[PDB]
Design a protein around this ligand. Structure first.
Ligand SMILES: Nc1ncnc2c1ncn2[C@@H]1O[C@H](COP(=O)(O)OP(=O)(O)O)[C@@H](O)[C@H]1O
Lengths: 124, 62, 105, 124, 62, 62, 62
């Protein structure tokens, strides 16, 4: 991938060994250029694979304990917490079905979601 | 009912330039001439700019 | 003695087929003029730094004296009006491109 | 993989050529089934690989930025415009700090609201 | 090497820029208006398509 | 081939759609609201309960 | 084994969980903010160090 001026120099080289050696030097230079181009993306891939390897190690130490190293997050326990917080109340029915729909959404909604946070506040 | 508007059209066509009328009678808002601020979404420019856009020339018969 | 071919960033290595395409239609007349020849031929040259078509149409010094004479292969005209085919058959280095006298050095 | 029904139908074919051709038909059916299965699986895997490559190249695009595009935020651009516009000016310090407060509010307000538009007009 | 990363026809964006540019090529544009258009187009390029600021900018530019 | 293994089929059930449908089945419904609710149910299906737009759409359904 | 595996990847973020926790230690503090900070730190560990929203969360923690 040598520039036009490089080909000009090779043409102006009138000795066979000179032109051959200059062409070989151009070959190695352009190979270095192209391999650097590839290496940048290859190293992006290496970074991602290392990061996901470390995330997989974190996943291993998280799942291996299976909550025997940490304690139950109680996020699912929020269901029963609220229900018992309401179980004792003689209550109409429409509100129960609304409560059930909100509970189902809570089950679907992720813990970190802002939708989830507003759902939690509304259910509170 | 003297044809003022009609003679305006006649001048516009004879001169080969364009025509555009305007009613200001009983009007009290400066904006129509000076448009709006361009800041209030849905704001519009002055009617004169619209006439220039429609005729697409700066030698109209306003 | 035909006008220099506008390389336009289409290097032609010796003994390596290449295709040159140029936007300007001026080369159409040149190509059509040489068809009548029983053995159409075309020279090939290399441009210098600071590429400029305006300089090409102004001065011939821009094109390197080095070049690669060869034969025009065949006309395609698939979608465009210029698909010049250039091959490297005979290297040449013009002694003085100002003045066509050329020695196959 | 012909079901019991197809095999019963074949067994009900006494003519050897007819049952052989029916078996060929079942073979072709399973051929198409497995061909579509493998084609769809390969489609899925290439699409997932394309997703991973899209993440790689989104990181490479972030590299492309070098403080271009998303890095301006469309509001800090107004910040820079106003600051450069008043830079040549020998500006009073009082109005300097008022402009600073207006820009701080600009950063404190979204880009899609009426009060933000009023702030932008006042700073204009 | 940085620039040559996912060309995709340069992602085929900022076509409104060139549209308005062609729109102005025929006209003899005064310097002040032209510099204002250049600044506004520069803002347009940096802005996402959805933002209402971008919409107002495009409407005014047209 | 569609129905091979769908664990997601259990959640976000289409049961609400049939519930509304039967709810309105015993009534002589206008074709207008009928097509409107068909469109709304289609949009809701293409939407996910996690979406707030899903909830607003469901409230309109109600 | 549980303890050593926890120690290998102890910190949710570099010298963040430990410093903030010990900072809280010397504070006789209500239950509500304990549960809130516990939730925030759990989601912190669930998040990556460089996430912009993770940085906003860390700012909130600070
Ligand atoms: N001298 C005239 N020549 C041609 N048309 C006339 C003449 N006088 C009046 N008219 C007609 O009377 C109509 C009155 O138009 P109008 O808009 O009322 O004019 P003005 O604004 O002068 O009242 C015009 O359409 C015009 O054709």
């Amino acid at each position: 991938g040598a520039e036009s001026h490089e080909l000009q120099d090779v043409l102006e080289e009138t000795n066979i060994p000179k032109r051959l050696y200059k062409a070989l030097s151009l070959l190695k230079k352009e190979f270095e250029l192209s391999k650097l181009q590839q290496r940048l993306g290859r190293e992006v891939e290496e970074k991602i694979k290392q990061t996901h390897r470390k995330f997989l190690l974190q996943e291993q130490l998280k799942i291996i304990k299976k909550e025997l190293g940490l304690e139950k997050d109680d996020k699912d326990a929020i269901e029963e917490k609220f229900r018992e917080r309401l179980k004792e109340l003689v209550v109409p029915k429409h509100v129960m079905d609304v409560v059930d729909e909100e509970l189902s959404k809570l089950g679907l909604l992720d813990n970190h979601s802002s939708e989830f946070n507003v759902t939690r506040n509304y259910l509170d | 009912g003297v044809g003022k508007t009609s003679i305006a059209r006649s001048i516009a066509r004879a001169l080969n330039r364009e025509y555009f009328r305007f009613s200001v009678g009983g009007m009290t808002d400066v904006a129509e001439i000076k448009g709006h601020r361009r800041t209030y979404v849905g704001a519009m420019p002055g009617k004169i700019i619209q006439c220039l856009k429609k005729t697409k020339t700066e030698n109209p018969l306003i | 003695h035909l006008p220099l071919i506008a390389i336009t960033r289409n290097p032609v290595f010796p003994r390596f087929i290449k295709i040159i395409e140029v936007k300007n239609k001026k080369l159409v007349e040149l190509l059509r003029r040489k068809v009548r020849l029983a053995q159409p031929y075309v020279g090939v040259f290399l441009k210098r730094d600071d590429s400029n078509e305006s300089d090409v149409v102004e001065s011939l010094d821009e094109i390197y004296h080095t070049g690669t004479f060869a034969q025009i292969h065949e006309m395609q005209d698939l979608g465009d009006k210029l698909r010049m085919i250039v091959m490297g058959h005979r290297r040449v280095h013009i002694s003085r491109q100002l003045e066509m006298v050329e020695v196959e050095n």
